[PDB]
């Protein structure tokens, strides 16, 4: 029985195998909507060469690749099963994975979608919190795909472009936190501080007007109310590649900060991502939770399990898609505004792609 | 009857006259809690005496003073009128004003509270979103008082140190946003961009783990939630004195930037303050809403009214105090945790003054 509604799940991606690291690093240092224009164009190729081996060693220490595709397919199969029951009018649903820097690419997903002859396609970013660097880049890749091929879509397009507060996402984060709190010694629980950590962004992207840190802040507050403020917390930010100023505090200087201050029981929370990856399994778990925490004299540092297979997350995906269908919306009202200081002619075109189709 | 419960309302304050300007900038600048520009001290009276008449000119542009004290007294009064009726067991309530930089100073209201022989004293920041530089500074002044004067307090103390998402607070904003909305030309109402505007912070303070920017973002999320996301929005940052990097985008820069990109219908919401003042009356109404504005070819730019004498806002302050009383909480859970990069030795003892008091 033929598919009617296709759900395009977007995330930058990750190299599934060690061999993949190279073009992942290349497609990414090429992506204009993510980063700065330093005669790049063909400067990325050099960088991909140098860094591949180093990054590769990083992926080596976590089973040799990212688990994103595994997780994404799991989440999507669950979502599809719920939606075939909850929304029979749109009854045959299909998901499609669309990665921005690894296979199956955004570009390869849309081509399989057009081939399937859908009545409907939805661009469902898997980033709950919006950045022009993240959701922006994936949505641009859709407009451009149809620019490149030179023909309007053969199906109605819409996007669920953000969801920083969906209540089930919030239930999921709060459940995973209670159950980790449960492993701290009963006498170390109440002093546990909850450190919410998200991927940072260059201050140049922040000062542009980028909506991401306001939205991430919205997720955090919403999880803390649901936790009834049981523990103190702080939102801090992980990564900061480069020379450039990024928004802080950094997650790393915060852990070392807390320790040097008699705060030694810390619960790390990956709050901007929906599954495991190099940021969580390498950067946070190995590296900050093992190497740095040892040097600091941490008594206990735990990491809230990522959502990954939590069935309640599938229920969250389905509920987003269904509410999105019933509301007949084209995109959030936030997508209709660009950053006050946007210097990107494509943003306004992606937006027009969703607001002004024909269906 | 004799006052039983005292509500110490804390605010930074502002000069009620031109005569008061120089005294205000002196203390403002002599405040290590606020800035570590006391790089060399007595460089404070240097800048005070310096900039006094420039600032005096600003104040003349709006009536000859800051209205902060008139509005706080009126708020203080509706609040007391409400608490007597709604919490009769905490007898007659009385409000005291504790400005950081002008009369009445925090020290002056304490010495009165001490004399009034109250049963209970409540330190009630008038900043919804906590920052170490505002409320933290103001709480530290209470702890410094007692230290200075070298005796234990004669009354039981607690603090309401933050309230960024209180439901009545949010309704005031959504109500004010809505009424300013109706005043735009009808066929433009849906293209208005809502620019929420808070005092910025040095990157040095944000990057140290100041909680403010996270909380501010929480206040914005709730407002838009109650508005059902009826217009698109951004959260930007105003004021900003000096040459080191602060938290942007900047209001002015974003207003400008929007107008050049086609978005010439703008509503300002001063989201981090409850009263009209220099930042609202001069920096926003004039310089943003006139000079820079009509100069960019703004079609319409309005500003939602300050909370001021809204009767719903007094109800918010009494509601917070009532709940505080029934909670028996000494301070928010947040307060019990210092910035992870806190360097101010005062912070820790101000914690214990509220948590570990000897009455
Ligand atoms: C414009 C700002 C951004 C820049 C410059 C950037 C850049 C990069 C780069 C170069 C890598 C490769 C890993 C490395 O070289 O260390 C990476 C990895 C990663 N980034 Fe970002 N990114 C940005 C925004 C974001 C945001 C907002 C998120 C939010 C979730 C994010 C999530 C991730 C994840 C999950 C990985 C690891 C992927 C895997 O396991 O395969 N990025 N980023
Ligand atoms: C540590 C970071 C901060 C610094 C260094 C700072 C510095 C200053 C300075 C020097 C002024 C006077 C401007 C002038 O003389 O023209 C000022 C004004 C003001 N600030 Fe800040 N500020 C900080 C954070 C904040 C925050 C977070 C708030 C509340 C959201 C705030 C509320 C105000 C208000 C209401 C004024 C108006 C002053 C007046 O009424 O004359 N400040 N700030
Ligand atoms: S950079 Fe945000 S809309 Fe273009
Ligand atoms: S500077 Fe925030 S706890 Fe001291």
JSON list of N, CA, C and O in Angstrom, two decimals, chain B residues 240-291:
[
{"chain": "B", "resi": 240, "resn": "UNK", "atom": "N", "xyz": [24.53, 49.08, 27.31]},
{"chain": "B", "resi": 240, "resn": "UNK", "atom": "CA", "xyz": [25.88, 48.70, 26.94]},
{"chain": "B", "resi": 240, "resn": "UNK", "atom": "C", "xyz": [26.79, 49.93, 26.96]},
{"chain": "B", "resi": 240, "resn": "UNK", "atom": "O", "xyz": [26.79, 50.73, 26.04]},
{"chain": "B", "resi": 241, "resn": "UNK", "atom": "N", "xyz": [27.52, 50.11, 28.05]},
{"chain": "B", "resi": 241, "resn": "UNK", "atom": "CA", "xyz": [28.50, 51.19, 28.19]},
{"chain": "B", "resi": 241, "resn": "UNK", "atom": "C", "xyz": [29.92, 50.63, 28.15]},
{"chain": "B", "resi": 241, "resn": "UNK", "atom": "O", "xyz": [30.25, 49.66, 28.86]},
{"chain": "B", "resi": 242, "resn": "UNK", "atom": "N", "xyz": [30.77, 51.25, 27.32]},
{"chain": "B", "resi": 242, "resn": "UNK", "atom": "CA", "xyz": [32.17, 50.86, 27.24]},
{"chain": "B", "resi": 242, "resn": "UNK", "atom": "C", "xyz": [32.59, 50.25, 25.92]},
{"chain": "B", "resi": 242, "resn": "UNK", "atom": "O", "xyz": [31.79, 50.21, 24.97]},
{"chain": "B", "resi": 243, "resn": "UNK", "atom": "N", "xyz": [33.85, 49.79, 25.84]},
{"chain": "B", "resi": 243, "resn": "UNK", "atom": "CA", "xyz": [34.47, 49.18, 24.67]},
{"chain": "B", "resi": 243, "resn": "UNK", "atom": "C", "xyz": [34.71, 47.64, 24.72]},
{"chain": "B", "resi": 243, "resn": "UNK", "atom": "O", "xyz": [35.00, 47.05, 23.66]},
{"chain": "B", "resi": 244, "resn": "UNK", "atom": "N", "xyz": [34.64, 46.99, 25.88]},
{"chain": "B", "resi": 244, "resn": "UNK", "atom": "CA", "xyz": [34.75, 45.52, 25.88]},
{"chain": "B", "resi": 244, "resn": "UNK", "atom": "C", "xyz": [33.50, 44.87, 25.23]},
{"chain": "B", "resi": 244, "resn": "UNK", "atom": "O", "xyz": [32.48, 45.57, 25.02]},
{"chain": "B", "resi": 245, "resn": "UNK", "atom": "N", "xyz": [33.56, 43.58, 24.86]},
{"chain": "B", "resi": 245, "resn": "UNK", "atom": "CA", "xyz": [32.37, 42.99, 24.19]},
{"chain": "B", "resi": 245, "resn": "UNK", "atom": "C", "xyz": [31.21, 42.69, 25.13]},
{"chain": "B", "resi": 245, "resn": "UNK", "atom": "O", "xyz": [31.41, 42.08, 26.19]},
{"chain": "B", "resi": 246, "resn": "UNK", "atom": "N", "xyz": [30.01, 43.11, 24.73]},
{"chain": "B", "resi": 246, "resn": "UNK", "atom": "CA", "xyz": [28.76, 42.79, 25.44]},
{"chain": "B", "resi": 246, "resn": "UNK", "atom": "C", "xyz": [27.86, 41.87, 24.67]},
{"chain": "B", "resi": 246, "resn": "UNK", "atom": "O", "xyz": [28.12, 41.53, 23.49]},
{"chain": "B", "resi": 247, "resn": "UNK", "atom": "N", "xyz": [26.77, 41.47, 25.33]},
{"chain": "B", "resi": 247, "resn": "UNK", "atom": "CA", "xyz": [25.80, 40.51, 24.79]},
{"chain": "B", "resi": 247, "resn": "UNK", "atom": "C", "xyz": [24.89, 41.20, 23.75]},
{"chain": "B", "resi": 247, "resn": "UNK", "atom": "O", "xyz": [24.10, 42.06, 24.07]},
{"chain": "B", "resi": 248, "resn": "UNK", "atom": "N", "xyz": [25.01, 40.80, 22.50]},
{"chain": "B", "resi": 248, "resn": "UNK", "atom": "CA", "xyz": [24.18, 41.32, 21.46]},
{"chain": "B", "resi": 248, "resn": "UNK", "atom": "C", "xyz": [23.27, 40.24, 20.92]},
{"chain": "B", "resi": 248, "resn": "UNK", "atom": "O", "xyz": [23.26, 39.10, 21.43]},
{"chain": "B", "resi": 249, "resn": "UNK", "atom": "N", "xyz": [22.52, 40.55, 19.86]},
{"chain": "B", "resi": 249, "resn": "UNK", "atom": "CA", "xyz": [22.50, 41.79, 19.07]},
{"chain": "B", "resi": 249, "resn": "UNK", "atom": "C", "xyz": [22.17, 42.95, 19.94]},
{"chain": "B", "resi": 249, "resn": "UNK", "atom": "O", "xyz": [21.72, 42.77, 21.08]},
{"chain": "B", "resi": 250, "resn": "UNK", "atom": "N", "xyz": [22.32, 44.13, 19.37]},
{"chain": "B", "resi": 250, "resn": "UNK", "atom": "CA", "xyz": [21.97, 45.35, 20.08]},
{"chain": "B", "resi": 250, "resn": "UNK", "atom": "C", "xyz": [20.66, 45.85, 19.54]},
{"chain": "B", "resi": 250, "resn": "UNK", "atom": "O", "xyz": [20.41, 45.77, 18.31]},
{"chain": "B", "resi": 251, "resn": "UNK", "atom": "N", "xyz": [19.84, 46.38, 20.45]},
{"chain": "B", "resi": 251, "resn": "UNK", "atom": "CA", "xyz": [18.56, 46.89, 20.08]},
{"chain": "B", "resi": 251, "resn": "UNK", "atom": "C", "xyz": [18.66, 47.84, 18.89]},
{"chain": "B", "resi": 251, "resn": "UNK", "atom": "O", "xyz": [18.12, 47.55, 17.82]},
{"chain": "B", "resi": 252, "resn": "UNK", "atom": "N", "xyz": [19.35, 48.96, 19.09]},
{"chain": "B", "resi": 252, "resn": "UNK", "atom": "CA", "xyz": [19.59, 49.92, 18.02]},
{"chain": "B", "resi": 252, "resn": "UNK", "atom": "C", "xyz": [20.03, 49.23, 16.72]},
{"chain": "B", "resi": 252, "resn": "UNK", "atom": "O", "xyz": [19.38, 49.37, 15.65]},
{"chain": "B", "resi": 253, "resn": "UNK", "atom": "N", "xyz": [21.10, 48.44, 16.80]},
{"chain": "B", "resi": 253, "resn": "UNK", "atom": "CA", "xyz": [21.62, 47.75, 15.61]},
{"chain": "B", "resi": 253, "resn": "UNK", "atom": "C", "xyz": [20.52, 46.89, 14.96]},
{"chain": "B", "resi": 253, "resn": "UNK", "atom": "O", "xyz": [20.44, 46.79, 13.76]},
{"chain": "B", "resi": 254, "resn": "UNK", "atom": "N", "xyz": [19.64, 46.30, 15.77]},
{"chain": "B", "resi": 254, "resn": "UNK", "atom": "CA", "xyz": [18.66, 45.35, 15.26]},
{"chain": "B", "resi": 254, "resn": "UNK", "atom": "C", "xyz": [17.47, 46.11, 14.71]},
{"chain": "B", "resi": 254, "resn": "UNK", "atom": "O", "xyz": [16.90, 45.73, 13.68]},
{"chain": "B", "resi": 255, "resn": "UNK", "atom": "N", "xyz": [17.06, 47.17, 15.39]},
{"chain": "B", "resi": 255, "resn": "UNK", "atom": "CA", "xyz": [16.06, 48.03, 14.82]},
{"chain": "B", "resi": 255, "resn": "UNK", "atom": "C", "xyz": [16.47, 48.44, 13.38]},
{"chain": "B", "resi": 255, "resn": "UNK", "atom": "O", "xyz": [15.75, 48.20, 12.40]},
{"chain": "B", "resi": 256, "resn": "UNK", "atom": "N", "xyz": [17.66, 49.02, 13.29]},
{"chain": "B", "resi": 256, "resn": "UNK", "atom": "CA", "xyz": [18.25, 49.49, 12.04]},
{"chain": "B", "resi": 256, "resn": "UNK", "atom": "C", "xyz": [18.22, 48.38, 11.03]},
{"chain": "B", "resi": 256, "resn": "UNK", "atom": "O", "xyz": [17.55, 48.50, 9.95]},
{"chain": "B", "resi": 257, "resn": "UNK", "atom": "N", "xyz": [18.88, 47.28, 11.40]},
{"chain": "B", "resi": 257, "resn": "UNK", "atom": "CA", "xyz": [19.02, 46.11, 10.52]},
{"chain": "B", "resi": 257, "resn": "UNK", "atom": "C", "xyz": [17.72, 45.56, 9.97]},
{"chain": "B", "resi": 257, "resn": "UNK", "atom": "O", "xyz": [17.67, 45.07, 8.85]},
{"chain": "B", "resi": 258, "resn": "UNK", "atom": "N", "xyz": [16.67, 45.63, 10.76]},
{"chain": "B", "resi": 258, "resn": "UNK", "atom": "CA", "xyz": [15.36, 45.12, 10.41]},
{"chain": "B", "resi": 258, "resn": "UNK", "atom": "C", "xyz": [14.79, 45.98, 9.30]},
{"chain": "B", "resi": 258, "resn": "UNK", "atom": "O", "xyz": [14.32, 45.45, 8.28]},
{"chain": "B", "resi": 259, "resn": "UNK", "atom": "N", "xyz": [14.89, 47.31, 9.50]},
{"chain": "B", "resi": 259, "resn": "UNK", "atom": "CA", "xyz": [14.33, 48.33, 8.59]},
{"chain": "B", "resi": 259, "resn": "UNK", "atom": "C", "xyz": [14.94, 48.27, 7.22]},
{"chain": "B", "resi": 259, "resn": "UNK", "atom": "O", "xyz": [14.26, 48.61, 6.25]},
{"chain": "B", "resi": 260, "resn": "UNK", "atom": "N", "xyz": [16.21, 47.88, 7.16]},
{"chain": "B", "resi": 260, "resn": "UNK", "atom": "CA", "xyz": [16.92, 47.78, 5.88]},
{"chain": "B", "resi": 260, "resn": "UNK", "atom": "C", "xyz": [16.56, 46.52, 5.15]},
{"chain": "B", "resi": 260, "resn": "UNK", "atom": "O", "xyz": [16.63, 46.48, 3.91]},
{"chain": "B", "resi": 261, "resn": "UNK", "atom": "N", "xyz": [16.12, 45.51, 5.90]},
{"chain": "B", "resi": 261, "resn": "UNK", "atom": "CA", "xyz": [15.70, 44.22, 5.31]},
{"chain": "B", "resi": 261, "resn": "UNK", "atom": "C", "xyz": [14.22, 44.15, 4.99]},
{"chain": "B", "resi": 261, "resn": "UNK", "atom": "O", "xyz": [13.71, 43.11, 4.56]},
{"chain": "B", "resi": 262, "resn": "UNK", "atom": "N", "xyz": [13.51, 45.27, 5.17]},
{"chain": "B", "resi": 262, "resn": "UNK", "atom": "CA", "xyz": [12.08, 45.32, 4.88]},
{"chain": "B", "resi": 262, "resn": "UNK", "atom": "C", "xyz": [11.14, 45.32, 6.06]},
{"chain": "B", "resi": 262, "resn": "UNK", "atom": "O", "xyz": [9.92, 45.47, 5.90]},
{"chain": "B", "resi": 263, "resn": "UNK", "atom": "N", "xyz": [11.68, 45.14, 7.27]},
{"chain": "B", "resi": 263, "resn": "UNK", "atom": "CA", "xyz": [10.79, 44.97, 8.40]},
{"chain": "B", "resi": 263, "resn": "UNK", "atom": "C", "xyz": [10.72, 46.27, 9.14]},
{"chain": "B", "resi": 263, "resn": "UNK", "atom": "O", "xyz": [11.52, 46.54, 10.04]},
{"chain": "B", "resi": 264, "resn": "UNK", "atom": "N", "xyz": [9.75, 47.09, 8.76]},
{"chain": "B", "resi": 264, "resn": "UNK", "atom": "CA", "xyz": [9.72, 48.45, 9.25]},
{"chain": "B", "resi": 264, "resn": "UNK", "atom": "C", "xyz": [8.58, 48.64, 10.23]},
{"chain": "B", "resi": 264, "resn": "UNK", "atom": "O", "xyz": [8.21, 49.79, 10.55]},
{"chain": "B", "resi": 265, "resn": "UNK", "atom": "N", "xyz": [8.00, 47.52, 10.67]},
{"chain": "B", "resi": 265, "resn": "UNK", "atom": "CA", "xyz": [7.00, 47.55, 11.76]},
{"chain": "B", "resi": 265, "resn": "UNK", "atom": "C", "xyz": [7.45, 46.78, 12.99]},
{"chain": "B", "resi": 265, "resn": "UNK", "atom": "O", "xyz": [7.55, 45.54, 12.99]},
{"chain": "B", "resi": 266, "resn": "UNK", "atom": "N", "xyz": [7.72, 47.53, 14.05]},
{"chain": "B", "resi": 266, "resn": "UNK", "atom": "CA", "xyz": [8.49, 47.06, 15.18]},
{"chain": "B", "resi": 266, "resn": "UNK", "atom": "C", "xyz": [7.78, 47.47, 16.44]},
{"chain": "B", "resi": 266, "resn": "UNK", "atom": "O", "xyz": [7.32, 48.61, 16.55]},
{"chain": "B", "resi": 267, "resn": "UNK", "atom": "N", "xyz": [7.68, 46.54, 17.39]},
{"chain": "B", "resi": 267, "resn": "UNK", "atom": "CA", "xyz": [7.17, 46.85, 18.72]},
{"chain": "B", "resi": 267, "resn": "UNK", "atom": "C", "xyz": [8.29, 46.54, 19.75]},
{"chain": "B", "resi": 267, "resn": "UNK", "atom": "O", "xyz": [8.86, 45.47, 19.76]},
{"chain": "B", "resi": 268, "resn": "UNK", "atom": "N", "xyz": [8.65, 47.51, 20.56]},
{"chain": "B", "resi": 268, "resn": "UNK", "atom": "CA", "xyz": [9.62, 47.30, 21.64]},
{"chain": "B", "resi": 268, "resn": "UNK", "atom": "C", "xyz": [8.89, 46.88, 22.91]},
{"chain": "B", "resi": 268, "resn": "UNK", "atom": "O", "xyz": [7.84, 47.44, 23.23]},
{"chain": "B", "resi": 269, "resn": "UNK", "atom": "N", "xyz": [9.46, 45.88, 23.59]},
{"chain": "B", "resi": 269, "resn": "UNK", "atom": "CA", "xyz": [9.02, 45.46, 24.90]},
{"chain": "B", "resi": 269, "resn": "UNK", "atom": "C", "xyz": [10.22, 45.43, 25.81]},
{"chain": "B", "resi": 269, "resn": "UNK", "atom": "O", "xyz": [11.14, 44.62, 25.64]},
{"chain": "B", "resi": 270, "resn": "UNK", "atom": "N", "xyz": [10.21, 46.29, 26.81]},
{"chain": "B", "resi": 270, "resn": "UNK", "atom": "CA", "xyz": [11.31, 46.26, 27.75]},
{"chain": "B", "resi": 270, "resn": "UNK", "atom": "C", "xyz": [11.03, 45.14, 28.71]},
{"chain": "B", "resi": 270, "resn": "UNK", "atom": "O", "xyz": [10.27, 45.30, 29.65]},
{"chain": "B", "resi": 271, "resn": "UNK", "atom": "N", "xyz": [11.63, 44.00, 28.45]},
{"chain": "B", "resi": 271, "resn": "UNK", "atom": "CA", "xyz": [11.23, 42.77, 29.09]},
{"chain": "B", "resi": 271, "resn": "UNK", "atom": "C", "xyz": [11.85, 42.48, 30.49]},
{"chain": "B", "resi": 271, "resn": "UNK", "atom": "O", "xyz": [11.40, 41.55, 31.17]},
{"chain": "B", "resi": 272, "resn": "UNK", "atom": "N", "xyz": [12.86, 43.25, 30.90]},
{"chain": "B", "resi": 272, "resn": "UNK", "atom": "CA", "xyz": [13.62, 42.96, 32.14]},
{"chain": "B", "resi": 272, "resn": "UNK", "atom": "C", "xyz": [13.48, 44.05, 33.18]},
{"chain": "B", "resi": 272, "resn": "UNK", "atom": "O", "xyz": [14.33, 44.15, 34.08]},
{"chain": "B", "resi": 273, "resn": "UNK", "atom": "N", "xyz": [12.46, 44.88, 33.07]},
{"chain": "B", "resi": 273, "resn": "UNK", "atom": "CA", "xyz": [12.22, 45.91, 34.08]},
{"chain": "B", "resi": 273, "resn": "UNK", "atom": "C", "xyz": [10.72, 46.17, 34.21]},
{"chain": "B", "resi": 273, "resn": "UNK", "atom": "O", "xyz": [9.98, 46.01, 33.25]},
{"chain": "B", "resi": 274, "resn": "UNK", "atom": "N", "xyz": [10.28, 46.58, 35.40]},
{"chain": "B", "resi": 274, "resn": "UNK", "atom": "CA", "xyz": [8.85, 46.75, 35.71]},
{"chain": "B", "resi": 274, "resn": "UNK", "atom": "C", "xyz": [8.37, 48.20, 35.71]},
{"chain": "B", "resi": 274, "resn": "UNK", "atom": "O", "xyz": [7.20, 48.49, 35.94]},
{"chain": "B", "resi": 275, "resn": "UNK", "atom": "N", "xyz": [9.30, 49.12, 35.48]},
{"chain": "B", "resi": 275, "resn": "UNK", "atom": "CA", "xyz": [9.02, 50.52, 35.61]},
{"chain": "B", "resi": 275, "resn": "UNK", "atom": "C", "xyz": [9.72, 51.28, 34.50]},
{"chain": "B", "resi": 275, "resn": "UNK", "atom": "O", "xyz": [10.78, 50.88, 34.06]},
{"chain": "B", "resi": 276, "resn": "UNK", "atom": "N", "xyz": [9.09, 52.37, 34.06]},
{"chain": "B", "resi": 276, "resn": "UNK", "atom": "CA", "xyz": [9.71, 53.36, 33.18]},
{"chain": "B", "resi": 276, "resn": "UNK", "atom": "C", "xyz": [10.95, 53.93, 33.82]},
{"chain": "B", "resi": 276, "resn": "UNK", "atom": "O", "xyz": [10.98, 54.19, 35.03]},
{"chain": "B", "resi": 277, "resn": "UNK", "atom": "N", "xyz": [11.96, 54.17, 33.01]},
{"chain": "B", "resi": 277, "resn": "UNK", "atom": "CA", "xyz": [13.14, 54.83, 33.52]},
{"chain": "B", "resi": 277, "resn": "UNK", "atom": "C", "xyz": [14.01, 55.34, 32.37]},
{"chain": "B", "resi": 277, "resn": "UNK", "atom": "O", "xyz": [13.56, 55.39, 31.23]},
{"chain": "B", "resi": 278, "resn": "UNK", "atom": "N", "xyz": [15.26, 55.71, 32.66]},
{"chain": "B", "resi": 278, "resn": "UNK", "atom": "CA", "xyz": [16.14, 56.32, 31.66]},
{"chain": "B", "resi": 278, "resn": "UNK", "atom": "C", "xyz": [16.27, 55.49, 30.36]},
{"chain": "B", "resi": 278, "resn": "UNK", "atom": "O", "xyz": [16.23, 56.04, 29.26]},
{"chain": "B", "resi": 279, "resn": "UNK", "atom": "N", "xyz": [16.39, 54.16, 30.54]},
{"chain": "B", "resi": 279, "resn": "UNK", "atom": "CA", "xyz": [16.55, 53.20, 29.44]},
{"chain": "B", "resi": 279, "resn": "UNK", "atom": "C", "xyz": [15.30, 53.11, 28.63]},
{"chain": "B", "resi": 279, "resn": "UNK", "atom": "O", "xyz": [15.38, 52.95, 27.41]},
{"chain": "B", "resi": 280, "resn": "UNK", "atom": "N", "xyz": [14.14, 53.21, 29.28]},
{"chain": "B", "resi": 280, "resn": "UNK", "atom": "CA", "xyz": [12.87, 53.29, 28.56]},
{"chain": "B", "resi": 280, "resn": "UNK", "atom": "C", "xyz": [12.61, 54.70, 28.03]},
{"chain": "B", "resi": 280, "resn": "UNK", "atom": "O", "xyz": [12.44, 54.88, 26.83]},
{"chain": "B", "resi": 281, "resn": "UNK", "atom": "N", "xyz": [12.57, 55.70, 28.93]},
{"chain": "B", "resi": 281, "resn": "UNK", "atom": "CA", "xyz": [12.06, 57.05, 28.60]},
{"chain": "B", "resi": 281, "resn": "UNK", "atom": "C", "xyz": [12.95, 57.87, 27.64]},
{"chain": "B", "resi": 281, "resn": "UNK", "atom": "O", "xyz": [12.43, 58.56, 26.75]},
{"chain": "B", "resi": 282, "resn": "UNK", "atom": "N", "xyz": [14.27, 57.77, 27.84]},
{"chain": "B", "resi": 282, "resn": "UNK", "atom": "CA", "xyz": [15.24, 58.42, 26.96]},
{"chain": "B", "resi": 282, "resn": "UNK", "atom": "C", "xyz": [15.83, 57.45, 25.92]},
{"chain": "B", "resi": 282, "resn": "UNK", "atom": "O", "xyz": [15.69, 57.68, 24.73]},
{"chain": "B", "resi": 283, "resn": "UNK", "atom": "N", "xyz": [16.49, 56.37, 26.34]},
{"chain": "B", "resi": 283, "resn": "UNK", "atom": "CA", "xyz": [17.16, 55.50, 25.37]},
{"chain": "B", "resi": 283, "resn": "UNK", "atom": "C", "xyz": [16.21, 54.84, 24.36]},
{"chain": "B", "resi": 283, "resn": "UNK", "atom": "O", "xyz": [16.57, 54.71, 23.19]},
{"chain": "B", "resi": 284, "resn": "UNK", "atom": "N", "xyz": [15.02, 54.42, 24.80]},
{"chain": "B", "resi": 284, "resn": "UNK", "atom": "CA", "xyz": [14.08, 53.83, 23.85]},
{"chain": "B", "resi": 284, "resn": "UNK", "atom": "C", "xyz": [13.23, 54.90, 23.13]},
{"chain": "B", "resi": 284, "resn": "UNK", "atom": "O", "xyz": [13.41, 55.11, 21.92]},
{"chain": "B", "resi": 285, "resn": "UNK", "atom": "N", "xyz": [12.35, 55.60, 23.85]},
{"chain": "B", "resi": 285, "resn": "UNK", "atom": "CA", "xyz": [11.43, 56.59, 23.23]},
{"chain": "B", "resi": 285, "resn": "UNK", "atom": "C", "xyz": [12.10, 57.60, 22.28]},
{"chain": "B", "resi": 285, "resn": "UNK", "atom": "O", "xyz": [11.50, 58.04, 21.28]},
{"chain": "B", "resi": 286, "resn": "UNK", "atom": "N", "xyz": [13.35, 57.95, 22.62]},
{"chain": "B", "resi": 286, "resn": "UNK", "atom": "CA", "xyz": [14.17, 58.97, 21.95]},
{"chain": "B", "resi": 286, "resn": "UNK", "atom": "C", "xyz": [15.51, 58.31, 21.62]},
{"chain": "B", "resi": 286, "resn": "UNK", "atom": "O", "xyz": [16.08, 57.62, 22.47]},
{"chain": "B", "resi": 287, "resn": "UNK", "atom": "N", "xyz": [16.05, 58.46, 20.42]},
{"chain": "B", "resi": 287, "resn": "UNK", "atom": "CA", "xyz": [17.34, 57.80, 20.11]},
{"chain": "B", "resi": 287, "resn": "UNK", "atom": "C", "xyz": [17.11, 56.47, 19.40]},
{"chain": "B", "resi": 287, "resn": "UNK", "atom": "O", "xyz": [17.86, 56.13, 18.47]},
{"chain": "B", "resi": 288, "resn": "UNK", "atom": "N", "xyz": [16.10, 55.71, 19.84]},
{"chain": "B", "resi": 288, "resn": "UNK", "atom": "CA", "xyz": [15.69, 54.49, 19.14]},
{"chain": "B", "resi": 288, "resn": "UNK", "atom": "C", "xyz": [14.36, 54.70, 18.39]},
{"chain": "B", "resi": 288, "resn": "UNK", "atom": "O", "xyz": [14.23, 54.33, 17.23]},
{"chain": "B", "resi": 289, "resn": "UNK", "atom": "N", "xyz": [13.38, 55.31, 19.07]},
{"chain": "B", "resi": 289, "resn": "UNK", "atom": "CA", "xyz": [12.03, 55.49, 18.53]},
{"chain": "B", "resi": 289, "resn": "UNK", "atom": "C", "xyz": [11.89, 56.79, 17.72]},
{"chain": "B", "resi": 289, "resn": "UNK", "atom": "O", "xyz": [10.89, 56.98, 17.02]},
{"chain": "B", "resi": 290, "resn": "UNK", "atom": "N", "xyz": [12.89, 57.67, 17.81]},
{"chain": "B", "resi": 290, "resn": "UNK", "atom": "CA", "xyz": [12.87, 58.91, 17.02]},
{"chain": "B", "resi": 290, "resn": "UNK", "atom": "C", "xyz": [14.14, 59.09, 16.18]},
{"chain": "B", "resi": 290, "resn": "UNK", "atom": "O", "xyz": [14.14, 58.77, 14.98]},
{"chain": "B", "resi": 291, "resn": "UNK", "atom": "N", "xyz": [15.21, 59.59, 16.79]},
{"chain": "B", "resi": 291, "resn": "UNK", "atom": "CA", "xyz": [16.48, 59.82, 16.09]},
{"chain": "B", "resi": 291, "resn": "UNK", "atom": "C", "xyz": [16.81, 58.70, 15.09]},
{"chain": "B", "resi": 291, "resn": "UNK", "atom": "O", "xyz": [16.47, 58.81, 13.90]}
]
